[PDB]
Structure formats: C-alpha cells, structure tokens
Design a protein around this ligand. Structure first.
Ligand SMILES: [Mg+2]
Ligand SMILES: [Mg+2]
Ligand SMILES: [Mg+2]
Ligand SMILES: [Mg+2]
Ligand SMILES: [Mg+2]
Ligand SMILES: [Mg+2]
Ligand SMILES: [Mg+2]
Ligand SMILES: [Mg+2]
Ligand SMILES: [Mg+2]
Ligand SMILES: [Mg+2]
Lengths: 50, 63, 31, 107, 50, 59
RNA sequence: UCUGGGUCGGGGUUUCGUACGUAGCAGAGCAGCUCCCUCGCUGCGAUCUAUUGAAAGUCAGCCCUCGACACAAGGGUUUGU
RNA sequence: AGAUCUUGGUGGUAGUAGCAAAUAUUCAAACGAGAACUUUGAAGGCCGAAGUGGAGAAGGGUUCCAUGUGAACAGCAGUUGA
C-alpha cells in the first residue's frame, strides 16, 4: 500500500445507530424517551407498580 | 345415501326452489325411504323437511 | 316435564344453523 | 396422561403470510390441522364446523390474524382405525389476544 | 451496514477538511482458537501437506 | 455530528438522512423522509397533522 | 448439556396516524316543552375537543426474552482394509 | 429392401408435450372395500332478470322417470352419470 488513499489515517467523528428496521430517527433509547416523553405504556406501568 | 330425488320432490311440493329445501341431516335414512310426493307431504308436516326463510334483502338502508 | 338438562339438549336440536338462520319449530316422528 | 385438553392461540397471520388471495382461507385450515398434529401428536384431526366458520368469517382472503382454539385429544375407541386417538379442535371466542397463555383446561 | 461521519485529510481535494458520510460494513469477529498446525513442502508438483 | 436540521415535522435530522429541497424562490427546506416530503409538497399544514412537533406544541 | 429447539405471551424496533365507548354550556342549525324558565330543557345533527403520539399490525427470512405450555436419547435404509 | 409402394402390426420419441379462457372453495356427517369429485347440513362465493333463471320453435329420438351394475365410456376419480 503506497497510494494516499491507502495509509490515510481514519478519524471517526460519528457512527450512525438509528434503526435500520425502517426509517429510524433516534440514535439511542434514551434520546427517544427524552424526545417523546412519557407514553401510555409508561403511564400504566407505574400505575400498577407504583 | 343419495337424496337427489327427495330434494327435488320437496322442492315441488313446497313450491320453492331447491335452495330453500332443508332435509334433516340426521334423519337421512327416514327421508331416503320417501319415494313419493305423499311421503314428502308427511315428512314436511313431521318437521323433517323445512322451507328455509328468504335470504334478507333489507331496503332500510335505501329508505 | 322439561328439566334443565332437557332444555339444554333442546337447544341443540332447535339450532340448525348459525346466527341469522331460522329455528327448528318441531321434530315429530309418527307412523 | 393422554385424554388431556388444552387451549392455544394460533397466529394465523404468521402461517398464511405470502399466500395468494384465493388460497388464504383454505391454507388456514391446513395450518390449523398441521398445528393440531404437532402439539397433540394425533394424525387424526377433526375441525369443529364452528371453527370452520370462524376462519371463513371475513371471506376467503381476509382471514383473522389470530384464533383461539381448544385442542382435545379424545379416544377413537368407537370403531376400527389405525389411530387410537383423535384431536377435536374447537373455537373459543375471545375479546382480546393480549397476555393469552397456552393454558391447561379442565375437562 | 451503517454509515459514519469523518473529516477528510486529502490535500487538493474538494473535500479536504470537510465532513463526509460513508457506508461501512460491521463484521463481527470473535476470537479464533488455534487447534492445529499444518506443514507444507515445496515439490516440483506444488505444495503438499507434509 | 454536523449541523442537525429540522424537517416539515420538526424532527431532528441526522447526517446521511432525508433530502433537501431548494425552491426557485430561494427558500430551502429539508425533510426527514418521503412521508414528510410528500406532506410538504402537497401543501398540507403541519399544524393539522397529529404526529408533528408543530401540532404537539400548539395543542 | 452447563438442557435443547419450538408454540404462545412480553419487551424493543418500526409502519400508519389519534381507535370503540363515554364526556363536553364545542358545533352550521332544525324539530318538540314553556305554571316551567328570566335564560333555559328534550331529541336529530356532519364535524371538533379530552380520554389518545392513541388504536391496529410487526418475521412469516426483524431484535431480546428465560414468562407459560407441551415436546424432545426416536424412526427407516445402508456401509469393512 | 426399396416404388413419398398396398394392407396389417410394432418401436424410439416418452411416462414426454400436455390435462392453464370465463374469481372458489372449506368443514363435519352418512352410504360405501374405497371419497378432492357422490349425498345431506353449515359457511364463503359466482350467474345478477339482455341470468349460469323459468318456458318454447327447428333439430335430436327415448336422451324423460324409477331401480340396479360398477366391466368398458364420461382424456383424474367416482359410491355419480345424458
Ligand atoms: Mg432497513
Ligand atoms: Mg410479540
Ligand atoms: Mg417388404
Ligand atoms: Mg431393388
Ligand atoms: Mg408434464
Ligand atoms: Mg396443466
Ligand atoms: Mg355478483
Ligand atoms: Mg333454459
Ligand atoms: Mg335422467
Ligand atoms: Mg377417466
């Protein structure tokens, strides 16, 4: 390997982790929970379990 | 056995189509011995052969 | 006279179809 | 034991995925018949006529996604046949399919 | 597969000192376990397992 | 890690996602997907679509 | 097997876009009750609002379960320097 | 031994082409040695009154109707049948 394309240092700034099972639009579970806020499934979970 | 004759005779006696003839699925042997229109008349009165009601075509939606 | 079990088996013979089908008015055997 | 009865829910939608329109309801009854041969082991499977009405309730192509059945492994000791047990599958009407487990049912 | 974001270190290019996205393939590589050794000998008919 | 833009729906758009539309009048928009883009191009109001950020903060 | 893999269930993701029912001094208005009421009450009424980013689907070739249930050391045909 | 010979028979092709025009079947039971096809019942469909309905002319000539058989025929089967 001698071309400049070879031996060129790779410095990642960002890695995509959105859902590939469709048109995902959130990177993490926590980011999705933060943006949307509480849902019905989260309300009734603590409605019974306090 | 086969009740092709009995359904046709009951269709004529009841003055309906073969659509509307109900032969008893349980008393098949009783009906299979009915070879004449008189026996069909007796089986109709006995309740083994029944005229089914007209399929509903309501005009309530149109009204 | 009709008891609870006689009425229960009566329900089988009088229903000769699904919902919307007519009920079986009688079933009499005579010779 | 061997005369047990149990109560399952069959994901019809999963088993009829990809089937064409004029075959979804007939394939549903083949899939229910094939299901009953698995969990009960009997080659002789009888489908209750009310269960046949449930599958065809919405026509030939819009078969329901889920169906709640009841598999009963009864004795074939009424005649001479290569099978000594048959499975009679009936139809259990339910208003919901959430949190429904495969439950053993008393006779 | 996914995609990343990285700065480019390619002088003389339109994308020098710019952020680009690039498709990448993730290949899961658990450690391999060595369970044997083969020796070969060079013959006038090729390499053969010694 | 670049600039994060916002859609017809007001959702956050990450690099490598969605499209950018440059109208002749000079205004430029970006969309998360083809659902948001088609809604914009059909001139449907984002404040009348329930899953839109603009709807949820109006109501 | 330190069990196994199924079938349901659950969670995750995701698709569409806010379900039935109930409630509303919301609603173009209209028809009936006026000792009645001093501005009201009885029906019809598309639609709107809250419940409700809800409802519904989601592997069948999506991801993780270790929750439930049964089942799995079985069958048949062959093969020797 | 010939005549694209006459008549009769038989191969390869070959268990091959094919049995693909008009949406569609399913469950249970009975008869039966035997049921995808018969019959009954339940369901889902089609013709949709310019019909896949009910009756005639011409033509056919017994195909009509009962009972029975399951050889051959109905290009799969058949307990059914013109
Ligand atoms: Mg994808
Ligand atoms: Mg699930
Ligand atoms: Mg010769
Ligand atoms: Mg010669
Ligand atoms: Mg062939
Ligand atoms: Mg063919
Ligand atoms: Mg029609
Ligand atoms: Mg005619
Ligand atoms: Mg005849
Ligand atoms: Mg034939």
């Amino acid at each position: 390997q001698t071309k400049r394309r070879a031996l060129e240092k790779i410095d990642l700034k960002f890695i995509d982790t959105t859902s590939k099972f469709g048109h995902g639009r959130f990177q993490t579970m926590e980011e999705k929970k933060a943006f949307m806020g509480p849902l019905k499934k989260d309300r009734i979970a603590k409605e019974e379990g306090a | 056995s086969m009740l092709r004759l009995q359904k046709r005779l009951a269709s004529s006696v009841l003055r309906c189509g073969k659509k509307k003839v109900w032969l008893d699925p349980n008393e098949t042997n009783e009906i299979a011995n009915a070879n004449s229109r008189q026996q069909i008349r007796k089986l109709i009165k006995d309740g083994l052969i029944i005229r089914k009601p007209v399929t509903v075509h309501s005009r309530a939606r149109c009204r | 006279i009709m008891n609870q079990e006689k009425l229960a088996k009566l329900q089988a013979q009088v229903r000769i179809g699904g919902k919307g089908t007519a009920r079986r008015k009688k079933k009499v055997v005579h010779r | 034991n061997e005369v047990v009865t149990r109560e399952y829910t069959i994901n019809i939608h999963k088993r009829i995925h990809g089937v064409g329109f004029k075959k979804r309801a007939p394939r549903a009854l083949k899939e229910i018949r094939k299901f009953a041969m698995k969990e009960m082991g009997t080659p002789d499977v009888r489908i209750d006529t009310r269960l046949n009405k449930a599958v065809w309730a919405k026509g030939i192509r819009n078969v329901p996604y889920r169906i709640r059945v009841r598999l009963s492994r009864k004795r074939n000791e009424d005649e001479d046949s290569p099978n000594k047990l048959y499975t009679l599958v009936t139809y259990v009407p339910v208003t919901t399919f959430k949190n429904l487990q495969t439950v053993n049912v008393d006779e | 597969m996914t995609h990343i974001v990285r700065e480019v270190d390619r002088p003389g290019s339109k994308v020098n000192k710019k952020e680009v996205v690039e498709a990448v393939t993730i290949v899961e590589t658990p450690p391999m376990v060595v369970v044997g050794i083969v020796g070969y000998v060079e013959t006038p008919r090729g390499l053969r397992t010694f | 890690m670049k600039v994060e833009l916002c859609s017809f729906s007001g959702y956050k758009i990450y690099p490598g996602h969605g499209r950018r539309y440059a109208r002749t009048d000079g205004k430029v928009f970006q969309f998360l997907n083809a659902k948001c883009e088609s809604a914009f191009l059909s001139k449907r109001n984002p404040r009348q679509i329930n899953w839109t950020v603009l709807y949820r903060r109006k109501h």
